[PDB]
Symmetry: none
Subunit: 144 residues, 2 copies
């Protein structure tokens, strides 16, 4: 998640108990329907980096992880079609997020927070990524 | 929770993150099944005092709270039947916990910690209470 202290936005990790509640859903509910609402709830306010921490326990269940990854790739690819880069990037300027930046594969949590909380035209990359994961989890539920 | 720093166990509250995650979990579907494993993880290592904070954070769900209260009262009464007293308790000495002590009604957090961590027959009052709350939450899930 993101804290706002000295007028600055910075990362704060999911508490161990919060992450452990997710981990316990994932291990206990074998990708039954409530993984969906559980993810929604527990991913509230998350950055992509945080979501990627939540997906660490999902990597223990490759069947599910494969399903989810395929959906992430699809959604990232469509994002990029819908957001063509006009370029080139001005010196020193943070790029607009690509699909892989939203997924947190190519971005730092500091970049993520900048997109989320910058003063002009923020991009809610955590919430966009959470939608992608929800699509994937819904598919896991219908395929397990 | 409880911390142990140089020979003294003391209370540390659940983080605001953790408590807010619990709230989100409860309200995603309004006591969807996900609350049961989630509560287990979120309340790990808690005192009754901490569990009561969790409950007060969802106290606007009065229907659920009444269902949980009835179960607490049942379990507390059966705990008291199962533990007739008998002492002797010296004037310098913490009583053995009763049902209302386990529930955090008639006990302070310092008393709870004393029972949980004393070396002479500790009583895991937090875990006992957690068991009661689980029964109540399972009932909430079915009755909502």
């Amino acid at each position: 998640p993101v804290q706002h202290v000295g007028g600055t936005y910075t990362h704060i990790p999911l508490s161990p108990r919060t992450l452990n509640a997710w981990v316990k859903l994932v291990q206990q509910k074998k990708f039954g329907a409530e993984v969906v609402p559980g993810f929604q709830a527990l991913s509230e306010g998350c950055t992509p980096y945080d979501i990627n921490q939540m997906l660490n326990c999902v990597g223990d269940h490759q069947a599910a992880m494969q399903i989810i990854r395929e959906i992430i790739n699809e959604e990232a690819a469509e994002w990029d079609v819908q957001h063509p880069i006009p370029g080139p990037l001005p010196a020193g300027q943070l790029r607009e997020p690509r699909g892989s930046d939203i997924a947190g594969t190519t971005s730092t949590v500091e970049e993520q927070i900048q997109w989320m909380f910058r003063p002009q035209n923020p991009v809610p990359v955590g919430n966009i990524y959470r939608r992608w994961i929800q699509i994937g989890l819904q598919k896991c539920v219908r395929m397990y």
